PDB file of all heavy atoms in Angstrom:
ATOM      1  N   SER D   1      -8.233 -82.869   5.388  1.00 51.66           N
ATOM      2  CA  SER D   1      -8.704 -83.033   4.015  1.00 51.66           C
ATOM      3  C   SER D   1      -7.668 -83.339   2.945  1.00 51.66           C
ATOM      4  O   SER D   1      -7.900 -84.186   2.084  1.00 51.66           O
ATOM      5  CB  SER D   1      -9.472 -81.787   3.568  1.00 51.66           C
ATOM      6  OG  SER D   1     -10.714 -81.668   4.239  1.00 51.66           O
ATOM      7  N   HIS D   2      -6.534 -82.649   2.991  1.00 48.39           N
ATOM      8  CA  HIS D   2      -5.513 -82.827   1.963  1.00 48.39           C
ATOM      9  C   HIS D   2      -4.240 -83.516   2.440  1.00 48.39           C
ATOM     10  O   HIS D   2      -3.206 -83.444   1.768  1.00 48.39           O
ATOM     11  CB  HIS D   2      -5.169 -81.453   1.378  1.00 48.39           C
ATOM     12  CG  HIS D   2      -6.372 -80.624   1.052  1.00 48.39           C
ATOM     13  ND1 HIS D   2      -6.574 -79.362   1.575  1.00 48.39           N
ATOM     14  CD2 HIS D   2      -7.459 -80.890   0.288  1.00 48.39           C
ATOM     15  CE1 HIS D   2      -7.734 -78.892   1.149  1.00 48.39           C
ATOM     16  NE2 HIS D   2      -8.291 -79.800   0.368  1.00 48.39           N
ATOM     17  N   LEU D   3      -4.324 -84.207   3.574  1.00 45.64           N
ATOM     18  CA  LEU D   3      -3.161 -84.862   4.163  1.00 45.64           C
ATOM     19  C   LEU D   3      -3.102 -86.387   4.107  1.00 45.64           C
ATOM     20  O   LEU D   3      -2.084 -86.970   4.461  1.00 45.64           O
ATOM     21  CB  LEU D   3      -3.022 -84.413   5.616  1.00 45.64           C
ATOM     22  CG  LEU D   3      -3.085 -82.899   5.829  1.00 45.64           C
ATOM     23  CD1 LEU D   3      -2.915 -82.589   7.303  1.00 45.64           C
ATOM     24  CD2 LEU D   3      -2.000 -82.214   5.007  1.00 45.64           C
ATOM     25  N   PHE D   4      -4.182 -87.032   3.673  1.00 47.06           N
ATOM     26  CA  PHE D   4      -4.224 -88.493   3.587  1.00 47.06           C
ATOM     27  C   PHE D   4      -3.830 -89.173   4.901  1.00 47.06           C
ATOM     28  O   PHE D   4      -3.154 -90.208   4.907  1.00 47.06           O
ATOM     29  CB  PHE D   4      -3.319 -88.989   2.449  1.00 47.06           C
ATOM     30  CG  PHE D   4      -3.773 -88.539   1.085  1.00 47.06           C
ATOM     31  CD1 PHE D   4      -3.060 -87.571   0.374  1.00 47.06           C
ATOM     32  CD2 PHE D   4      -4.944 -89.049   0.527  1.00 47.06           C
ATOM     33  CE1 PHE D   4      -3.513 -87.123  -0.864  1.00 47.06           C
ATOM     34  CE2 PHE D   4      -5.399 -88.605  -0.707  1.00 47.06           C
ATOM     35  CZ  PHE D   4      -4.686 -87.636  -1.409  1.00 47.06           C
ATOM     36  N   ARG D   5      -4.278 -88.606   6.018  1.00 41.70           N
ATOM     37  CA  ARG D   5      -3.946 -89.162   7.327  1.00 41.70           C
ATOM     38  C   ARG D   5      -4.629 -90.495   7.610  1.00 41.70           C
ATOM     39  O   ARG D   5      -4.234 -91.213   8.532  1.00 41.70           O
ATOM     40  CB  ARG D   5      -4.285 -88.156   8.428  1.00 41.70           C
ATOM     41  CG  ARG D   5      -3.657 -86.791   8.204  1.00 41.70           C
ATOM     42  CD  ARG D   5      -3.319 -86.094   9.506  1.00 41.70           C
ATOM     43  NE  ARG D   5      -2.212 -86.746  10.200  1.00 41.70           N
ATOM     44  CZ  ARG D   5      -1.704 -86.318  11.350  1.00 41.70           C
ATOM     45  NH1 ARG D   5      -2.207 -85.236  11.931  1.00 41.70           N
ATOM     46  NH2 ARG D   5      -0.701 -86.969  11.921  1.00 41.70           N
ATOM     47  N   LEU D   6      -5.646 -90.836   6.825  1.00 44.84           N
ATOM     48  CA  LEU D   6      -6.319 -92.116   7.038  1.00 44.84           C
ATOM     49  C   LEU D   6      -5.772 -93.207   6.124  1.00 44.84           C
ATOM     50  O   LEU D   6      -6.306 -94.315   6.077  1.00 44.84           O
ATOM     51  CB  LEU D   6      -7.832 -91.981   6.841  1.00 44.84           C
ATOM     52  CG  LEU D   6      -8.541 -90.948   7.728  1.00 44.84           C
ATOM     53  CD1 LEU D   6     -10.056 -91.089   7.570  1.00 44.84           C
ATOM     54  CD2 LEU D   6      -8.153 -91.159   9.186  1.00 44.84           C
ATOM     55  N   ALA D   7      -4.701 -92.902   5.395  1.00 47.47           N
ATOM     56  CA  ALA D   7      -4.106 -93.899   4.514  1.00 47.47           C
ATOM     57  C   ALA D   7      -3.696 -95.108   5.350  1.00 47.47           C
ATOM     58  O   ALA D   7      -3.133 -94.967   6.439  1.00 47.47           O
ATOM     59  CB  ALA D   7      -2.890 -93.322   3.786  1.00 47.47           C
ATOM     60  N   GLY D   8      -3.992 -96.298   4.838  1.00 46.71           N
ATOM     61  CA  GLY D   8      -3.658 -97.517   5.552  1.00 46.71           C
ATOM     62  C   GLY D   8      -4.777 -98.027   6.449  1.00 46.71           C
ATOM     63  O   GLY D   8      -4.763 -99.185   6.875  1.00 46.71           O
ATOM     64  N   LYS D   9      -5.752 -97.171   6.737  1.00 45.64           N
ATOM     65  CA  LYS D   9      -6.863 -97.555   7.599  1.00 45.64           C
ATOM     66  C   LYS D   9      -8.039 -98.093   6.805  1.00 45.64           C
ATOM     67  O   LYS D   9      -8.270 -97.694   5.663  1.00 45.64           O
ATOM     68  CB  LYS D   9      -7.315 -96.360   8.442  1.00 45.64           C
ATOM     69  CG  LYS D   9      -6.188 -95.763   9.268  1.00 45.64           C
ATOM     70  CD  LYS D   9      -6.661 -94.659  10.191  1.00 45.64           C
ATOM     71  CE  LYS D   9      -5.463 -93.984  10.839  1.00 45.64           C
ATOM     72  NZ  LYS D   9      -4.555 -94.995  11.455  1.00 45.64           N
ATOM     73  N   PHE D  10      -8.781 -99.010   7.415  1.00 43.70           N
ATOM     74  CA  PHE D  10      -9.939 -99.595   6.760  1.00 43.70           C
ATOM     75  C   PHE D  10     -11.180 -99.000   7.386  1.00 43.70           C
ATOM     76  O   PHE D  10     -11.325 -98.983   8.611  1.00 43.70           O
ATOM     77  CB  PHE D  10      -9.920-101.118   6.897  1.00 43.70           C
ATOM     78  CG  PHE D  10      -8.712-101.759   6.269  1.00 43.70           C
ATOM     79  CD1 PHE D  10      -7.558-101.977   7.014  1.00 43.70           C
ATOM     80  CD2 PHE D  10      -8.716-102.099   4.921  1.00 43.70           C
ATOM     81  CE1 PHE D  10      -6.417-102.521   6.424  1.00 43.70           C
ATOM     82  CE2 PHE D  10      -7.581-102.645   4.320  1.00 43.70           C
ATOM     83  CZ  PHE D  10      -6.433-102.855   5.073  1.00 43.70           C
ATOM     84  N   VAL D  11     -12.069 -98.514   6.531  1.00 47.52           N
ATOM     85  CA  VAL D  11     -13.284 -97.859   6.975  1.00 47.52           C
ATOM     86  C   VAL D  11     -14.532 -98.634   6.623  1.00 47.52           C
ATOM     87  O   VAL D  11     -14.677 -99.127   5.507  1.00 47.52           O
ATOM     88  CB  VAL D  11     -13.394 -96.450   6.347  1.00 47.52           C
ATOM     89  CG1 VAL D  11     -14.626 -95.730   6.862  1.00 47.52           C
ATOM     90  CG2 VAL D  11     -12.140 -95.646   6.667  1.00 47.52           C
ATOM     91  N   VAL D  12     -15.418 -98.758   7.601  1.00 48.14           N
ATOM     92  CA  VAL D  12     -16.697 -99.427   7.410  1.00 48.14           C
ATOM     93  C   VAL D  12     -17.737 -98.373   7.758  1.00 48.14           C
ATOM     94  O   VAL D  12     -17.621 -97.699   8.784  1.00 48.14           O
ATOM     95  CB  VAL D  12     -16.871-100.627   8.364  1.00 48.14           C
ATOM     96  CG1 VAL D  12     -18.297-101.170   8.261  1.00 48.14           C
ATOM     97  CG2 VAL D  12     -15.864-101.716   8.019  1.00 48.14           C
ATOM     98  N   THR D  13     -18.738 -98.202   6.905  1.00 47.23           N
ATOM     99  CA  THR D  13     -19.764 -97.220   7.196  1.00 47.23           C
ATOM    100  C   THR D  13     -21.093 -97.910   7.403  1.00 47.23           C
ATOM    101  O   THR D  13     -21.358 -98.970   6.827  1.00 47.23           O
ATOM    102  CB  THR D  13     -19.905 -96.174   6.073  1.00 47.23           C
ATOM    103  OG1 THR D  13     -20.384 -96.800   4.875  1.00 47.23           O
ATOM    104  CG2 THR D  13     -18.560 -95.519   5.796  1.00 47.23           C
ATOM    105  N   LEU D  14     -21.909 -97.314   8.261  1.00 43.44           N
ATOM    106  CA  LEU D  14     -23.232 -97.838   8.566  1.00 43.44           C
ATOM    107  C   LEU D  14     -24.205 -96.673   8.536  1.00 43.44           C
ATOM    108  O   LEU D  14     -24.037 -95.699   9.268  1.00 43.44           O
ATOM    109  CB  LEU D  14     -23.249 -98.480   9.963  1.00 43.44           C
ATOM    110  CG  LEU D  14     -24.608 -98.913  10.527  1.00 43.44           C
ATOM    111  CD1 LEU D  14     -25.249 -99.940   9.602  1.00 43.44           C
ATOM    112  CD2 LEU D  14     -24.422 -99.501  11.926  1.00 43.44           C
ATOM    113  N   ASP D  15     -25.208 -96.751   7.669  1.00 48.21           N
ATOM    114  CA  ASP D  15     -26.203 -95.696   7.623  1.00 48.21           C
ATOM    115  C   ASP D  15     -27.556 -96.368   7.770  1.00 48.21           C
ATOM    116  O   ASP D  15     -27.804 -97.434   7.204  1.00 48.21           O
ATOM    117  CB  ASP D  15     -26.092 -94.837   6.352  1.00 48.21           C
ATOM    118  CG  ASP D  15     -26.395 -95.591   5.083  1.00 48.21           C
ATOM    119  OD1 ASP D  15     -25.506 -96.291   4.565  1.00 48.21           O
ATOM    120  OD2 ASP D  15     -27.535 -95.462   4.605  1.00 48.21           O
ATOM    121  N   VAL D  16     -28.410 -95.740   8.569  1.00 47.55           N
ATOM    122  CA  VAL D  16     -29.709 -96.296   8.916  1.00 47.55           C
ATOM    123  C   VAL D  16     -30.852 -95.324   8.646  1.00 47.55           C
ATOM    124  O   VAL D  16     -30.857 -94.210   9.159  1.00 47.55           O
ATOM    125  CB  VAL D  16     -29.675 -96.691  10.417  1.00 47.55           C
ATOM    126  CG1 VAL D  16     -30.960 -97.384  10.830  1.00 47.55           C
ATOM    127  CG2 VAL D  16     -28.469 -97.608  10.669  1.00 47.55           C
ATOM    128  N   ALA D  17     -31.814 -95.757   7.835  1.00 49.03           N
ATOM    129  CA  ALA D  17     -32.967 -94.929   7.479  1.00 49.03           C
ATOM    130  C   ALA D  17     -34.260 -95.552   7.991  1.00 49.03           C
ATOM    131  O   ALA D  17     -34.439 -96.765   7.924  1.00 49.03           O
ATOM    132  CB  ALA D  17     -33.039 -94.760   5.965  1.00 49.03           C
ATOM    133  N   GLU D  18     -35.161 -94.713   8.491  1.00 45.13           N
ATOM    134  CA  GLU D  18     -36.431 -95.191   9.022  1.00 45.13           C
ATOM    135  C   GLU D  18     -37.571 -95.114   8.015  1.00 45.13           C
ATOM    136  O   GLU D  18     -38.712 -95.445   8.336  1.00 45.13           O
ATOM    137  CB  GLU D  18     -36.801 -94.400  10.277  1.00 45.13           C
ATOM    138  CG  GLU D  18     -35.822 -94.581  11.419  1.00 45.13           C
ATOM    139  CD  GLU D  18     -35.623 -96.037  11.784  1.00 45.13           C
ATOM    140  OE1 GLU D  18     -36.637 -96.727  12.033  1.00 45.13           O
ATOM    141  OE2 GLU D  18     -34.456 -96.491  11.818  1.00 45.13           O
ATOM    142  N   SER D  19     -37.261 -94.683   6.796  1.00 43.95           N
ATOM    143  CA  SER D  19     -38.275 -94.565   5.756  1.00 43.95           C
ATOM    144  C   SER D  19     -37.677 -94.646   4.355  1.00 43.95           C
ATOM    145  O   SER D  19     -38.385 -94.479   3.361  1.00 43.95           O
ATOM    146  CB  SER D  19     -39.030 -93.243   5.911  1.00 43.95           C
ATOM    147  OG  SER D  19     -38.143 -92.141   5.835  1.00 43.95           O
ATOM    148  N   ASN D  20     -36.376 -94.908   4.280  1.00 40.99           N
ATOM    149  CA  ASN D  20     -35.687 -95.002   2.997  1.00 40.99           C
ATOM    150  C   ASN D  20     -35.974 -93.722   2.213  1.00 40.99           C
ATOM    151  O   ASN D  20     -36.057 -92.641   2.795  1.00 40.99           O
ATOM    152  CB  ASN D  20     -36.186 -96.223   2.218  1.00 40.99           C
ATOM    153  CG  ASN D  20     -35.277 -96.590   1.056  1.00 40.99           C
ATOM    154  OD1 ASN D  20     -35.583 -97.491   0.275  1.00 40.99           O
ATOM    155  ND2 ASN D  20     -34.149 -95.895   0.941  1.00 40.99           N
ATOM    156  N   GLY D  21     -36.127 -93.843   0.897  1.00 39.01           N
ATOM    157  CA  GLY D  21     -36.413 -92.673   0.087  1.00 39.01           C
ATOM    158  C   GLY D  21     -35.339 -92.342  -0.933  1.00 39.01           C
ATOM    159  O   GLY D  21     -35.245 -91.205  -1.396  1.00 39.01           O
ATOM    160  N   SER D  22     -34.528 -93.335  -1.280  1.00 41.17           N
ATOM    161  CA  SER D  22     -33.458 -93.149  -2.254  1.00 41.17           C
ATOM    162  C   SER D  22     -32.541 -91.982  -1.898  1.00 41.17           C
ATOM    163  O   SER D  22     -32.719 -90.869  -2.391  1.00 41.17           O
ATOM    164  CB  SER D  22     -34.049 -92.919  -3.649  1.00 41.17           C
ATOM    165  OG  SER D  22     -34.790 -94.044  -4.087  1.00 41.17           O
ATOM    166  N   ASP D  23     -31.562 -92.240  -1.038  1.00 40.93           N
ATOM    167  CA  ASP D  23     -30.613 -91.211  -0.634  1.00 40.93           C
ATOM    168  C   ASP D  23     -29.221 -91.615  -1.105  1.00 40.93           C
ATOM    169  O   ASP D  23     -29.020 -92.736  -1.573  1.00 40.93           O
ATOM    170  CB  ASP D  23     -30.599 -91.051   0.887  1.00 40.93           C
ATOM    171  CG  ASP D  23     -30.161 -92.315   1.598  1.00 40.93           C
ATOM    172  OD1 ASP D  23     -28.941 -92.488   1.795  1.00 40.93           O
ATOM    173  OD2 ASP D  23     -31.031 -93.141   1.952  1.00 40.93           O
ATOM    174  N   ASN D  24     -28.260 -90.705  -0.979  1.00 38.98           N
ATOM    175  CA  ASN D  24     -26.891 -90.992  -1.394  1.00 38.98           C
ATOM    176  C   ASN D  24     -25.924 -90.829  -0.227  1.00 38.98           C
ATOM    177  O   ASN D  24     -24.780 -90.403  -0.402  1.00 38.98           O
ATOM    178  CB  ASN D  24     -26.481 -90.067  -2.542  1.00 38.98           C
ATOM    179  CG  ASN D  24     -27.410 -90.177  -3.734  1.00 38.98           C
ATOM    180  OD1 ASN D  24     -28.576 -89.795  -3.659  1.00 38.98           O
ATOM    181  ND2 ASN D  24     -26.899 -90.707  -4.840  1.00 38.98           N
ATOM    182  N   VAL D  25     -26.394 -91.171   0.966  1.00 40.72           N
ATOM    183  CA  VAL D  25     -25.565 -91.064   2.157  1.00 40.72           C
ATOM    184  C   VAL D  25     -24.358 -91.999   2.106  1.00 40.72           C
ATOM    185  O   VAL D  25     -23.233 -91.579   2.395  1.00 40.72           O
ATOM    186  CB  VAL D  25     -26.376 -91.353   3.439  1.00 40.72           C
ATOM    187  CG1 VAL D  25     -25.442 -91.474   4.641  1.00 40.72           C
ATOM    188  CG2 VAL D  25     -27.367 -90.221   3.679  1.00 40.72           C
TER     189      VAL D  25
END
């Protein structure tokens, strides 16, 4: 959490909903 070990890495996220519903995932 407080170490920035992912610095330099590129992150892509994928979230999939089967009914939507306005979420903040």
Side-chain angles (χ1 to χ4, degrees):
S1 290
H2 314 124
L3 310 181
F4 296 108
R5 307 212 70 179
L6 303 189
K9 304 185 188 309
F10 299 91
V11 183
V12 172
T13 66
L14 172 60
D15 65 278
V16 185
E18 297 305 307
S19 59
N20 195 185
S22 298
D23 62 88
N24 303 67
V25 170

